[PDB]
From a paper:
The dual functions of [name] as Ca2+-activated ion channel and lipid scramblase raise intriguing questions regarding their molecular basis.
Our structures show that both modulators replace the lipids found in this pocket in our drug-free sample. We thus speculate that, by binding to the upper part of TM6, these modulators may simultaneously lock the ion conduction pore as well as the gating element in a closed configuration.
Author numbering:
A (entry chain A): 59 to 82, 91 to 147, 185 to 222, 232 to 423, 457 to 487, 503 to 634, 647 to 871
B (entry chain B): 52 to 149, 183 to 426, 455 to 489, 503 to 868
Amino acid sequence: PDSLFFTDGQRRIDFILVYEDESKNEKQKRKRQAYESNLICHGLQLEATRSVSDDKLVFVKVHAPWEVLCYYAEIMHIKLPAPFEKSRMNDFYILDRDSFFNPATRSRIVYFILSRVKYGINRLVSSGIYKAAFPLHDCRFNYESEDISCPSERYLLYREWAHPRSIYKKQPLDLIRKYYGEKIGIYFAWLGYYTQMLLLAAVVGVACFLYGYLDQDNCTWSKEVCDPDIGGQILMCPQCDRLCPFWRLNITCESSKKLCIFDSFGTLIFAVFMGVWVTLFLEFWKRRQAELEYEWDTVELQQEEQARPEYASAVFFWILLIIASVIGIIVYRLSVFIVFSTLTPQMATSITASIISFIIIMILNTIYEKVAIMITNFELPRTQTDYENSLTMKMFLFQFVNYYSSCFYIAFFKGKFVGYPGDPVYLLGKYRSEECDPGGCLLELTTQLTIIMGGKAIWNNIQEVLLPWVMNLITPRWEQDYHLQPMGKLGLFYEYLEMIIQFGFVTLFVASFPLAPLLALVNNILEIRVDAWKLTTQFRRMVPEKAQDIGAWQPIMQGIAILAVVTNAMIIAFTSDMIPRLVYYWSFSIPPYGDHTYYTMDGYINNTLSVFNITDFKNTDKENPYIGLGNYTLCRYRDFRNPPGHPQEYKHNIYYWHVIAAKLAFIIVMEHIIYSVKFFISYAIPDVSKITKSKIKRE
Amino acid sequence: FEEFNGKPDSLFFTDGQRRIDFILVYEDESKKENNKKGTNEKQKRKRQAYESNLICHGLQLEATRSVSDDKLVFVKVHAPWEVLCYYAEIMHIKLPLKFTAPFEKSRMNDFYILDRDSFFNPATRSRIVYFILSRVKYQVMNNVNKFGINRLVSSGIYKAAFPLHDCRFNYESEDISCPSERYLLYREWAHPRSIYKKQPLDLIRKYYGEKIGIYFAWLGYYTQMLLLAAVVGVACFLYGYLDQDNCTWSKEVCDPDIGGQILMCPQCDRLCPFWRLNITCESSKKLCIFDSFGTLIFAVFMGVWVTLFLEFWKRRQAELEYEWDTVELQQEEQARPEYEAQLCASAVFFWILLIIASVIGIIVYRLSVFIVFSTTLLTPQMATSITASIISFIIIMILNTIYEKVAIMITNFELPRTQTDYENSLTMKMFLFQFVNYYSSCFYIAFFKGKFVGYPGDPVYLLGKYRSEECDPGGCLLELTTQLTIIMGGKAIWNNIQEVLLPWVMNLIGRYKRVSGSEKITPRWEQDYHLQPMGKLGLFYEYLEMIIQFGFVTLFVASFPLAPLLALVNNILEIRVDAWKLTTQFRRMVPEKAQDIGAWQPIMQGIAILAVVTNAMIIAFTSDMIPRLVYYWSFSIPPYGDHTYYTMDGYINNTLSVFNITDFKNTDKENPYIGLGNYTLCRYRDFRNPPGHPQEYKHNIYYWHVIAAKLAFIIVMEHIIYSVKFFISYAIPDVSKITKSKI
Ligand SMILES: N#Cc1c(C(F)(F)F)cc(O)n2c1nc1ccccc12
Ligand SMILES: *[C@@H]1O[C@H](CO)[C@@H](O)[C@H](O)[C@H]1NC(C)=O
Ligand SMILES: *[C@@H]1O[C@H](CO)[C@@H](O)[C@H](O)[C@H]1NC(C)=O
Ligand SMILES: [Ca+2]
């Protein structure tokens, strides 16, 4: 009756050893028989059952006798999930002398016993000695189990927390760590509290975004860019080599109006706020980690060493990092090139380039993970924890480069090192440096970032789980569980990697796009339930494991924060064009330099653009693109340089150095202020949380 | 009990087989009691309760009448083996060998035990009996328990309580069996005749405990690292000295054909007339010597050396912790609230007082300079700077004691939970007060002096009659160096003199209170009672002074390469000054244990972190290195300059600005400059457009280029030094290989 115990026997299962009869290399069959005989002889009860669907396949069952299992568990440091000790049976009440131990704990202990066995459960599966070994779920999730004794914990947890109907329901970590293990429990607690604080980040970001959005009318520079009498008269220079004429500047009202949203004081305030939000996230997560460590069964002894089933090139890895970064940059550049070489149209072309870049990123991710795995295996880590740590580092670095190259390029290395029209820059020869429009490449950067984040989260979640669930929205236990498949040894690793990449996206380039926390919040709200459903539905049961913290990812979080402060400062200083506007408003709109009687932004664009003379087309005396293109003689370009007819011909003028001094002063002041606040908040742990230590140490 | 038996240096009981551990001193009833005799009787009853409880707990006692004054009674103490072992077991004290488990009586055969007292060193016995005295209780009234030896001296029932020094420091004990550790320490450790021999930290630990041993080990290691730093700094200073004919700007200012022709512009109102830059040819030489690229190299080397010092101190700390086997007692630590006990307002008051202290320091330095300048009428300028620095240092020394007292009051008004909390609050408050007090003037000179003064036409008067001070063309680097060296050297000298003298003069006054020609033999306890009490704070002030010295060494090291040398000589003297005052003019401090220096280590970390930014800002703003580099790289070229190749020629002439004298606007004081009536334009240290021009006196391209270069240099140095410090910290294993093997 699909019972969780042996036939006509009150003994509960802990693994299924499925073996296919060789009758449909006899030394392999002899080894299998010897291993089974030894397993039986060690004092483990076993039953043999033939698959109902196919008689050829026979399943080998195992159990755990109470006395021997308890003795072998007490042999080493295993405590109660009052303390357990074979000298104190009557001292502490036992709910039942046959089922007191948590089924997860019994599965863990018997797994340890099988691990100690030598002719290798996974080795036997690889060699075909025993095809697989995996425990059984309490009940098939479709409907609650008939058996009264079985609590049907799987169905109960599914309905309570894995079904989307509980979307607003708070996290029930109780059954999670009672059934799956400490790893999944801590992972889900971390995910949930991350979402909790992403809510605060998203509300603050939305406040800043509305601050920017409601000031459209008073965005003077955009208004001037649009007014034909002001914007149109500015006949800009061509920004390419062979396929661009003199173009007016008022063709970019849509771009300027969109940019005035993400490039106002709201963005700066939001970056400042995220500066302290990141440290609050880290510190409060440390505190929740400590609280979980105290509350849950995390006082277990730490194992020293273990064997591995399978058992200087460091610079060689860095070369691969460099190649990957260059490949990403090349991919983005060629994508934009091909899309250009054919209101909405320019934005649609940018979106198409971003989509192609994301497609290439996703295609290359598989190659990156494969190469990382092989190179890590070539080193032959002594144990498995070291192997996981090294894989974490290498995989995270490939991901980091592959996902952030394009972003870093657009933010910093695009339009920042191009010369004046007379003497442009060709670093490698015939490879001109692209130049941003007067507003800058901030809008393109934010479009790229939002497209990448969306595409990743959406496509990944859909293709990995949601197909059965979206179409829905539109035999014995051992056989059924066998029909399922495992998650391997890096499923939790992949979930952590996805979450870390999402965190990096939301924190690093947060100045450009103040709405990133909201998208990450929605993604996490989806992802927690998606992962719950997938784990509890489509994947076999897993042996529980104990972990205190998330693992090797916390250092990545700290590094990402320390990098994000600098990245945000650099973005606001260079990528955006707010510092030039501030400097103009406060210094160059006055009689000493300007002509206005009071600080006003009137005439900013006009008075900021530098003029160029076609007659000085080249210092190299080569072919010019300004040939023909009408009877025009002078064109204005995006740079701070002295006009023709000045003693210094096309050299940086006073305004350039004023603006660069302002940029560096902003970088210094913001960096120092944010780091000081971060250090104060890290030093004020005792002065904020008088509650926690007193509560813990009083009782 | 009886009186003095006749053996003056005997450290045993009258029988001669028992050893003394403390001397309990009180005043007998034979004194002329006043006020209320009921209070006197209560003190008596408390005293008999004390003695009764002590005898009950198993401590043998005997009293003795002071030989000179009958009104003083000395009460000895002795710890038999049973009680000593009991309290050692409950303290988890680890016992010497030559892996390990706590100490139990059952295993005497596994330790090198010969006799009861001989096995236990006097320091541990004194600590054990001190704990016994602190914990024991006598009586309860008002439904509140009462106890504590410190409360006894607080109430005046007991004048003091202290262990006994082994013997006279300058003579061996007449007992052939006495180790006379004090004499050995005096002959080899103290008594600066041994100014060079390595101090025997093992004997210091054995005698004065780990609290003093760790301090002196830290001092010695600090001296060694300062020797390394001073050698490097001397190398850099010597390199700067051997190249003076090559400082082209120094030559230009010195040469009368170039510097003399430049008619500089008055800084003053009617106190100074015009003047020729050539007068400033010596300062220029000195600046060459202390602004050189040697200064930059030394600043980077200091950024590295502060780290190396911190991590090597951590390594030595781990070594000491292993060797001195303090782990068990470190694990078992328990403290009780101050017997005085038996918030945000205070914090804001402390911060306001700290701000006031900073402002007072700035104002006193400015007033000293003002009065010295007004009194005016080997360089006379140098003499004026030295006089102003001397006055400022005097006032700083005066205000130091006031700040100490106010910190004491602020911390006492609050209710510290336990001794450690009070100690840490005092550490923080004292360090902040002395930081502000000592460094306000230096920071003012470095950053806020001569940095926000306008052109001569429109000077910056703060609020009226207060014209902002401004520097010479080279900069105030030399003024800062003079002020810093004067402050540091004067503090070293005065501190050493005061430390050596004040306990000594107090002892001589105490003797003079008995002008009668006694000249006789007194027992050990009586003559040890005449030393100073060594107030319970302990090495707090020693650590404070060394932390101030370290702050001076690191914070401003971009303006004084010789600071490590001064610090080295000061520390070589300080080792022996502290050793002498500790061995010869103080009662035995009760031994204890400490993991580290204390609350000061976070202070040292903070100083190291702030040093990078302070040095970067010094080199960027107070020094004129960056303007020189900018001129050599971007203004000695045809686009702006005239030289075909990069060179420092014409630097001074081209750098300065010009001002039309008749272009002095404003109706107040219409005749500040035209009085002389000799020339019509003046040159001042500033980067501004010359007269005429569309932008007459607004900053020119040179100013903004130099500002951008300064900020870029600040960013680059900060980031590179921080990264190198991070990598140095990561690379260092923090524990030596020998320690790893043994541990
Ligand atoms: N020249 C020179 C100086 C020399 C040396 F002789 F070595 F060159 C040494 C020295 O201590 N100082 C020098 N100039 C100083 C100005 C202020 C304070 C100290 C000063
Ligand atoms: C720009 O202004 C000119 C004024 O002549 C005009 O004709 C054009 O429609 C405006 N808009 C764009 C996008 O060029
Ligand atoms: C000061 O300048 C005068 C005038 O050129 C010159 O004669 C004298 O030698 C100079 N003195 C110094 C010390 O430079
Ligand atoms: Ca001292």
